[PDB]
């Protein structure tokens, strides 16, 4: 069988599978109790897509589509209704065995980004506008081929037209903005349950816990300094889709390993659906050089003891 | 492919000591996991204590470290302490062979009795 393997990219090198950001630190919180079942950057170590996961960075938390008409909505501002297709631009079937189109979000929260908008036929009319995309809002229903997207700007979007949204940040981390990493959006509105979702991810021993690539995520205003949590960068994604090595054992074991002196600095578990766990004597950010990299050293199984961290 | 010699067995009187020793050889394995089962008539063969490659162990959850397991690559002592009747059993050395190219392989010693 072609033998398994992973990037050779350091920290510094890899991005965030669940937003177009840079990895800033490895994470791990044992009070978080939370169900972990992100939809964005899911693939297994043989190298199947899951959840809404799509290849592009460009996808992550993307929209493509045409707005239908202003509407009326409690939150403060102009408020749109927008069709969205598949990124792809060929028409989303809702019927498909996907949770929503590839690249949706899969967070509770406001996110912020840039509408923008090119006329359809040379010189075609073009603007971009700020816009927030509440994903707990009941008008968001990405699976049955509709949201709702809010401006700043009072007139100038078109409707029929191409349109692309940007994700930038969120717009809020208050109460009212109902940010949760962890919580899933309803893809098909009120009175629904999400269909062909990823699974949950969680260590199967106690001392383990689950081990994140963390990004700060930027806002447009307000306090705090909110972070996604990804399961796996998106060119572990990339790298395992194309691989698609047979997994040997549910449990790949995996060295952090400083490049400069060679030595490890750290061991892991890099489980067959696509997530890490350690054994750690402290919480938190990771103290850890950004030049390092995991090296895939064997497949071993749950009688592999983790060293702690 | 990996041959398992043991050695330190027999009989103890209660309160003694004795040393189990488990030495790999054939086709070991730079990452591994090594150490001992017990088995009673009766019962089904249960974890006594084990360690890997870069010295993790773990122990049943009753010998309340009055056992210790310690490691010379691919060999393992299990020290045996403050024994008692209850502890008279087959003691079986395991070694697990971990690669990057093939699925785990265990590898079971013949077994050495320990009369309490």
């Known amino acids: 069988s072609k033998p398994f393997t992973l990037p050779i990219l350091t920290l510094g090198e890899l991005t965030n599978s669940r937003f177009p950001l840079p990895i800033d630190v490895l994470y791990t919180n044992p009070n978080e109790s939370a169900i972990v079942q992100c939809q964005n950057g899911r693939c297994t170590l043989d190298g199947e897509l899951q959840g809404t996961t799509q290849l592009l960075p460009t996808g992550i938390c993307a929209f493509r589509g045409k707005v239908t008409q202003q509407v009326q909505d409690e939150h403060r501002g102009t408020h749109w209704n927008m069709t969205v297709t598949n990124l792809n631009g060929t028409p989303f079937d809702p019927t498909e065995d996907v949770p929503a189109p590839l690249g949706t979000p899969d967070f509770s929260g406001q996110i912020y980004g840039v509408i923008s908008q090119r006329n359809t036929n040379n010189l075609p009319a073009n603007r971009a506008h700020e816009a927030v995309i509440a994903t707990y809002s009941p008008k968001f229903t990405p699976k049955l081929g509709n949201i709702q997207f809010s401006t700043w700007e009072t007139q100038d979007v078109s409707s029929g037209q191409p349109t692309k949204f940007t994700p930038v940040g969120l717009a809020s981390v208050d109460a009212n903005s109902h940010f949760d990493q962890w919580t899933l959006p309803s893809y098909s509105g009120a009175l629904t349950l999400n269909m062909n979702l990823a699974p949950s991810v969680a260590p199967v021993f106690p001392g383990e816990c689950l081990l994140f690539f963390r990004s700060f995520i930027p806002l447009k205003g307000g306090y705090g300094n909110p972070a996604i949590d990804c399961l796996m960068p998106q060119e572990w994604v990339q790298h395992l889709y194309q691989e698609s090595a047979p997994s040997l054992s549910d449990v790949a074991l995996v060295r952090y390993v400083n490049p400069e002196t060679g030595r490890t600095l750290f061991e892991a578990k890099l489980h067959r659906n696509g997530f890490l766990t350690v054994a750690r004597n402290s919480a938190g950010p990771v103290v850890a050089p950004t030049n390092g990299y995991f090296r895939f050293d064997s497949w071993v199984n749950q009688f592999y003891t983790l060293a702690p961290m | 492919q990996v041959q398992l010699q043991e050695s330190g067995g027999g009989l103890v009187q209660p309160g003694g000591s004795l040393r189990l020793s488990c030495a790999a050889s054939?086709?070991?394995?730079?990452?591994?996991?090594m150490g001992w089962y017990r088995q009673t008539p009766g019962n089904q063969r249960e974890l006594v204590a084990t360690?890997?490659?870069?010295?993790?162990?773990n122990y049943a959850d009753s010998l309340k470290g009055r056992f210790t397991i310690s490691r010379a690559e691919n060999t393992v002592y299990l020290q045996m302490n403050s024994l008692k009747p209850e502890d008279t059993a087959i003691y079986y050395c395991?070694?697990?062979?971990?690669?990057?190219?093939?699925?785990?392989?265990?590898?079971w010693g013949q077994g050495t009795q320990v009369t309490v």
């Open positions: 395991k070694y697990i062979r971990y690669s990057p190219i093939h699925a785990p392989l265990d590898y």
């Open positions: 054939g086709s070991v394995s730079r990452t591994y996991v």
């Open positions: 360690i890997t490659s870069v010295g993790s162990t």
